[PDB]
Amino acid sequence: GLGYGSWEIDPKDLTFLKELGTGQFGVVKYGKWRGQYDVAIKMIKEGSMSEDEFIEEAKVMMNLSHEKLVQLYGVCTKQRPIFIITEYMANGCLLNYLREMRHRFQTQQLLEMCKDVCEAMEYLESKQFLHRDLAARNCLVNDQGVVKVSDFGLSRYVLDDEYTSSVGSKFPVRWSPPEVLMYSKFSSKSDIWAFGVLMWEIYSLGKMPYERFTNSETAEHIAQGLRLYRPHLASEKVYTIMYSCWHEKADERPTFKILLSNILDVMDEES
Ligand SMILES: Cc1nn(C2CCOCC2)cc1-c1nc2nccc(-c3ccc4c(c3)CCC[C@@H]4NC(=O)c3nc(C(C)(C)C)no3)c2[nH]1
């Protein structure tokens, strides 16, 4: 009503029910909107976000819609802390889901998770919109086992130098290409490299990439041409696709449209 924009949700319409976890912007909770509809609510901790810049960008993010992207519903900005309201995903983050051995996933199921994420990324690529922190920890799973991409773009609004600096403790070193580590040069092709590492995470059931190395050692080894190698559950055809993401030259890595075609082809050959 009066005083609320299209983007704005009235926080008094929210009921808070459970805590889901804590991350870069603070606490995230599960709740209901108008006593009926499941939602997730990010409560943005004081000092953690460039708030005015995010609010202006939220207008662009409200127009991004795809079945394999976590859906933004709105924001609450007339009070602090500000809230970000999204679709609720009942089975939690992909990294923890992969690590639960009781699921005993079949190889067909693993390739379907890769396809879910590739569909989302092809859509963002079509709108020239980078994720910038693609990894299994930033994907979520719903009650039907469908994987969706979460928190795309939000890296631009983090005020913590240990996350933003390429030599900081929280920087995603193990998901980054050589030109990001050396010159901090981000592009569609750095999202491509990260997607290859995510495919490796899926087929490895959530092991840490380069698990015997530090971040510093990983950066040096990548520069010398070392790469991750084939997980036991990945076929030769699947490993070819993930490895194509790691070409030293950025312009020789595929697009997400090409990767999606390749994944569909392997599904037809291995199903
Ligand atoms: C967990 C969980 N368990 N369960 C069930 C499992 C079965 O038993 C009952 C509980 C459900 C969930 C669950 N559903 C969800 N739906 C929507 C969103 C979230 C969500 C998304 C992101 C984050 C969290 C939560 C919590 C930790 C921090 C994290 N990152 C950011 O906040 C952040 N990171 C960045 C960047 C990438 C910019 C650093 N920005 O914000 C959801 N979590």
CA nearest neighbour of 152 among 69, 75, 85, 73: 69
216 with 134, same domain?
yes
Query: Which residues carry a binding-site annotation?
Result: 20-28, 42, 86-89, 154
Residue 3 lies in a domain: no
Q: What's 148's domain CATH number? A: 1.10.510.10
Domain closes at, from 41, 63, 87: 87
Q: Which of 33, 53, 89 best tests ligand 1's pocket when mutated (most atoms within 8 Å of CB)?
A: 89
Tell me which of 23, 52, 87 is where a domain ends.
87
**Within a 10 A sphere around the Cβ of 149, how many other Cβ atoms?**
24
Identify the sign of the CA torsion 40, 152, 200, 237.
positive
Q: Are residues 73 and 104 in the same domain?
A: no
Nearest ligand 1 atom to the CA of 158 is 38
Residue 5 counted as domain residue: no
Strand order, beta sheet including 26-33:
14-23, 26-33, 37-43, 83-86, 72-76
Q: What is the C-alpha separation between 228 and 6, in angstroms, rounded?
A: 46
**Ligand 1 binding pocket, CB closer than 6 Å:** 20-25, 28, 40, 42, 86, 88-89, 91-93, 133, 138, 140, 150-151, 154-155, 158
What contacts 194, CB < 8 A, 6 or more positions away? 131, 133, 134, 135, 172, 175, 176
**Range of 33's domain?**
14-87
**Count of the separate structural domains present in the chain:** 2
